[PDB]
Structure 1
Amino acid sequence: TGLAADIRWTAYGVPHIRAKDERGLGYGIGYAYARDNACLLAEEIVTARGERARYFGSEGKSSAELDNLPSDIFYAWLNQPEALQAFWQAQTPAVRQLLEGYAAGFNRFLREADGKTTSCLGQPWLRAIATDDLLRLTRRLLVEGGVGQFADALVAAAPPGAEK
């Protein structure tokens, strides 16, 4: 609570969010983004949570074109609870508030969605999000210039056997 935003949309559905604080500002962002892209965010959160194989099986791929199971192993390793907790603890009050607002606003849209702009209505993976999910997405992006480029390589790393 203490969440409030004013949203104006101009041509092409560009949102202009006004609020008195970061919580309210994030509230408007999460809501406007969900109106346009709820399904996209839901899918990418599934990816960043390492749950692709759980929802979609081993034959599919992520939108980064990694196989579901290796992708899941990588993101389960990357986004361990301890890593998420330390990341959260290091965040300023302003950033925490932005993220809290965003999650609340996205979830508000989900509660109200009737399919008008949401093609994945009714899918089990379209669900309320938490700030940890936004941390999962952030950390996924953070490592794109690093260990993220080696996701398959990390999954493939196993000690030698008895071979010659």
Structure 2
Amino acid sequence: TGLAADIRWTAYGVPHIRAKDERGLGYGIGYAYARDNACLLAEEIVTARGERARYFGSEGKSSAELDNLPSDIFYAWLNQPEALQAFWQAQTPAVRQLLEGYAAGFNRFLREADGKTTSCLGQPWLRAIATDDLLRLTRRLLVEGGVGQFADALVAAAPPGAEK
């Protein structure tokens, strides 16, 4: 609670969010974003949670074109509870507030969505998000210049057997 935003949209659906604080600002951002891109964010959160195989099976890929199971292994490894917790604890109050607002605003849109701009209405993976889900996305982006480029390679790493 204590979440309020004023949103103006101009041509092409560009939102202009006004708020008195970070929580309110994030509230407006998450709401506006969800109106345009709820399905996209839901899908990418499934990826960052390592739950692609759970919803979509082993034959599918992520939007990064990684196989679902290897992608899941990589993100489960990356976004372990301890890693998320440590990341959260290192955040400034202002950033924590932006993230709390964003989750709440996205979720507000989901509660009122009737399919007008949401093609994945009714899918089990379109669901309320948590600040931890936003941390999962942030950490996924963070490693895009590093270990994320080696996701398949990490999954493939096994000790040698008895071979000559």
State if a TM-score over 0.5 links the two structures. yes
**DSSP 3-state at the match of 1:12:** helix
**DSSP 3-state at the match of 1:163:** coil
Q: CA deviation at 1:112?
A: 0.2
Q: CA deviation at 1:144?
A: 0.1
Q: CA deviation at 1:74?
A: 0.0
* Aligned match of 1:56: 56
**DSSP 3-state at the match of 1:60:** coil
What TM-score do you get using the length of structure 1 for normalisation? 1.00
Equivalents in 2 of 1:60, 1:134: separation in Å? 23
Q: CA deviation at 1:143?
A: 0.1
Equivalents in 2 of 1:159, 1:5: separation in Å? 54
Equivalents in 1 of 2:55, 2:143: separation in Å? 24
Deviations 1:16-44 (A, max 9, x none): 00000000000000000000000000000
**DSSP 3-state at the match of 2:64:** coil
Q: CA deviation at 1:89?
A: 0.1
Equivalents in 2 of 1:127, 1:2: separation in Å? 22
**What RMSD over aligned residues (CA atoms) do the two structures have, in Å?**
0.1
Q: CA deviation at 1:3?
A: 0.1
Q: CA deviation at 1:163?
A: 0.3
Deviations 1:79-116 (A, max 9, x none): 00000000000000000000000000000000000000
Q: CA deviation at 1:48?
A: 0.1
Deviations 1:43-65 (A, max 9, x none): 00000000000000000000000
Runs of at least 4 residues off by over 4 Å = none
What are the equivalent positions in structure 2 for 1:9-28 lying under 5 Å apart? Answer: 9-28=9-28
Equivalents in 1 of 2:64, 2:92: separation in Å? 30
**DSSP 3-state at the match of 2:5:** strand
Q: CA deviation at 1:121?
A: 0.2
Identity %: 100
Aligned length: 164
Q: CA deviation at 1:9?
A: 0.1
* Aligned match of 1:128: 128
Equivalents in 2 of 1:130, 1:40: separation in Å? 16
Q: CA deviation at 1:77?
A: 0.0
What TM-score do you get using the length of structure 2 for normalisation? 1.00
Q: CA deviation at 1:158?
A: 0.1
